[PDB]
Chains A and B, each alone.
Chain A
Amino acid sequence: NRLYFHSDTCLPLRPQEMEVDDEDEKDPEWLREKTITQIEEFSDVNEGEKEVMKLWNLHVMKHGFIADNQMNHACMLFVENYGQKIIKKNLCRNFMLHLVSMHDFNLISIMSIDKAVTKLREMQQKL
């Protein structure tokens, strides 16, 4: 029994919309561009490393992984979803460096490295 407004525009909700203001999505687009932009600001980081980092961050932000136990699955899902971009943009070795760094951080198993690399190679065969 009161006029409600959208938090993003301050425009009123019609009774048709029936109390639904959901421009409160998990990954706000601006964070996606803020990350992309920040990685590019680095002088000491090469264009190869930068693109892998940007793609990984965009993936982690989309799925909202919060546990270390989700890291093995996250790498596998990274290949399925971003594999085409990795191959096409020629970042296959830089991705390999990301996987070993993740293993160094104790987030992924040794088999995850193999499985992810094996999956990316057969994805390249489809091309």
Chain B
Amino acid sequence: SFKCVNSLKEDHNQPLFGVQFNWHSKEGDPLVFATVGSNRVTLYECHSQGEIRLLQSYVDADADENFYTCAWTYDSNTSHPLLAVAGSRGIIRIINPITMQCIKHYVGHGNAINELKFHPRDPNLLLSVSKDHALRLWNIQTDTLVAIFGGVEGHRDEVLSADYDLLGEKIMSCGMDHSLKLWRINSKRMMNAIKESYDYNPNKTNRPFISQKIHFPDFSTRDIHRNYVDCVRWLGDLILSKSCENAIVCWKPGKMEDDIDKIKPSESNVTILGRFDYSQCDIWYMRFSMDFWQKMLALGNQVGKLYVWDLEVEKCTTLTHHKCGAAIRQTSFSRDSSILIAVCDDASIWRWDRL
């Protein structure tokens, strides 16, 4: 299954909150991953015999910044990879690793950003999830705010995680209010708002772009977890989510036979398909991840144990190492699933090679 092939340590000694492999990387190009912790963004390149090559590192001019999340995209024209980062200050930064500069920045969230996700089909649509109780959909081409997902029937506490589905037709969000909310982005309202954001040119007008204020989700539940929900990922049309109750719950909106795209907003039902058990992960802000093919699932715990599940169960390996005893904050799989990276509370990086 997996061999621990390298361990790295960043000089700041602060928790590393995010890891993301660049899945846009060409077939044959070396496998690159980004790291976020302290007020730093670090880029790495994977090589044979466990070799991790330190490529780039950025530091916010503000010492009080603390990056929590990052996400990779690409510029449609230039064909350059782009990396979005954000944390405690509520500012989104779009870094260009080819040009080695901050190419864009968005201020607008009234609090810390806990998650950043790029639309699986449109590289310009960026979703940010905030401590302010709202989600924001940005158009990174026209620098417009397409929609605000929050309000009367939005999250009542800090939004901790969100995920688009495979084709980018809908978003599933979760948070400290114990809620998991569905926000459809293939609706006529949302498709037009995306279209209109692309037509927007502030030079050809004196009026601001009109952002959609989506106060109502397309489904909402509080009956999956008894505490805060800190990670949510779609598994096809099913949902994978966790709290501090030492389990990842696999579930779906409505009754067993209810189709995801036929679920009415007033739906009071949920169907729990099953759960993935583990231990010592009762601390807040602990994220699970999947490979591109959604066949593998990984989750680290507060004492450095790394759990890997084979999702094709229509199996659990406990990856462990004597020198790894810190809280594993997040994991990342290479596109091809050959490399698995884990980041910790002690500025350490752990490389696990599949063989």
Contacts and interface: CB of A to CB of B under 8 A. Distances in A.
Contact of B216 (A8, A13, A30): A30
B167 to A, nearest CB: 27
Given A30-B151, A34-B152, A37-B266, A13 B208 contact: yes
A68 B265 CA distance: 36
Nearest to A18: B206
Interface string B143-180: 00100100110000000000000000000000000000
B323 interface: no
A14 B213 contact: no
A8 B213 contact: yes
Contacts, number: 39
Contacts of A9: 108, 145, 148, 211
A33 B145 contact: no
Contacts of A6: 208
B215 A30 contact: yes
A17 B207 contact: yes
B30 interface: no
Chain A: interface residue count, which band?
Answer: 10 to 19
A16 B201 CA distance: 13
A33 B208 contact: no
Interface SS of B by simple majority: loop
B208 A8 contact: no
Nearest to A40: B266
Nearest to A17: B208
B206 A16 contact: yes
Interface string B182-224: 0000000000000000000010011110010101100000000
A10 interface: yes
A10 B110 contact: yes
Contact of A10 (B108, B205, B215, B265): B108
Q: Which of A9, A29, A34, A37 has the most CB of B within 10 A?
A: A9
B208 A11 contact: yes
B133 to A, nearest CB: 13
Interface in B216-275: 216, 265-266
The residue among A13, A30, A41 with the most chain B CB atoms within 10 A of its own CB is A30
Given A8-B148, A9-B108, A11-B145, A29 B213 contact: yes
A33 B215 CA distance: 9
A8 B265 CA distance: 24
A33 B216 contact: yes
B152 A8 contact: no
Contact of A30 (B202, B207, B211, B213): B213
Contacts of A11: 108, 145, 208
Contacts of B202: 14, 16
A16 B98 CA distance: 34
B208 A14 contact: yes
Contacts of A17: 206-208
Most buried by A among B108, B205, B208: B208
Contacts of B107: 10
Nearest to A15: B206
Contacts of B208: 6, 11, 13-14, 17
A6 B145 CA distance: 12
Contacts of A37: 216, 265-266
A34 B211 CA distance: 20
A17 B210 CA distance: 13
B172 to A, nearest CB: 21
A30 B152 contact: yes
Interface of B: 107-110, 145, 148, 151-152, 202, 205-208, 211, 213, 215-216, 265-266
Given A13-B208, A30-B216, A33-B216, 9 more contacts: A10-B110, A11-B108, A14-B208, A16-B202, A16-B205, A17-B207, A30-B151, A33-B215, A37-B216
8 contacts: A8-B148, A10-B110, A11-B208, A14-B208, A16-B205, A33-B215, A37-B216, A37-B266
Interface of A: 6, 8-11, 13-14, 16-17, 29-30, 33-34, 37, 40-41
The 6 closest A-B pairs by CB, nearest first: A30-B215, A16-B206, A10-B108, A30-B152, A9-B211, A11-B108
